[PDB]
Amino acid sequence: DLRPVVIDGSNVAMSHGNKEVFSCRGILLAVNWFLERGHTDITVFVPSWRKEQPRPDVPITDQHILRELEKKKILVFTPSRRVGGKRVVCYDDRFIVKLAFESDGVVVSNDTYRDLQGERQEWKRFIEERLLMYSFVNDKFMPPDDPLGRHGPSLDNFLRKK
Ligand code: NA
């Protein structure tokens, strides 16, 4: 009955704590929020370059959580590597949207992925109908009761299928 959930890990971790810090607990807390309500189909995407700490230009906290969530079959790392000198990063967003679109679930993020909706009609509509935004207050993960405005549906039904 519950929609599959797909979380933009980077969006969430940046929002949580200092906005200039990749706060891995942000991801834990969001995940737990869905767990507590009964969800079991949950996926969080984060680039794999977040795993390696030898010189992190955006700082990170509680890095170990990523691999923790990987083991529980919740977090999935996204691909990236260095070509010649520089880092190249297969885009997060694509995995996030493609998965949610094809699993017919929801996307948890405050990014609206303007690039992607400019690429494909079907993705634009999906994003409009299926983005779930949120605010954090310290460690409280707070999504809106009215995810699509007063005209759309309640949180509870947004997260169901029928
Ligand atoms: Na943050």
Author numbering: 134 to 295
Q: What does the original paper state about this entry?
A:
Regnase-1 (also known as Zc3h12a and MCPIP1) is an RNase whose expression level is stimulated by lipopolysaccharides and prevents autoimmune diseases by directly controlling the stability of mRNAs of inflammatory genes such as interleukin (IL)-6, IL-1β, IL-2, and IL-12p404567. Regnase-1 accelerates target mRNA degradation via their 3′-terminal untranslated region (3′UTR), and also degrades its own mRNA8. Regnase-1 is a member of Regnase family and is composed of a PilT N-terminus like (PIN) domain followed by a CCCH-type zinc–finger (ZF) domain, which are conserved among Regnase family members. Our findings suggest that Regnase-1 cleaves its target mRNA by an NTD-activated functional PIN dimer, while the ZF increases RNA affinity in the vicinity of the PIN dimer.
X-ray crystallography was attempted for the fragment containing both the PIN and ZF domains, however, electron density was observed only for the PIN domain, consistent with a previous report on Regnase-1 derived from Homo sapiens. We found that the PIN domain formed a head-to-tail oligomer that was commonly observed in all three crystal forms in spite of the different crystallization conditions. In contrast, our gel filtration data, mutational analyses, and NMR spectra all indicate that the PIN domain forms a head-to-tail dimer in solution in a manner similar to the crystal structure. The previously reported crystal structure of the Regnase-1 PIN domain derived from Homo sapiens is nearly identical to the one derived from Mus musculus in this study, with a backbone RMSD of 0.2 Å. The importance of residues W182 and R183 can readily be understood in terms of the monomeric PIN structure as they are located near to the RNase catalytic site; however, the importance of residue K184, which points away from the active site is more easily rationalized in terms of the oligomeric structure, in which the “secondary” chain’s residue K184 is positioned near the “primary” chain’s catalytic site. In contrast, R214 is important for oligomerization of the PIN domain and the “secondary” chain’s residue R214 is also positioned near the “primary” chain’s active site within the dimer interface. Based on these observations, we concluded that PIN-PIN dimer formation is critical for Regnase-1 RNase activity in vitro.
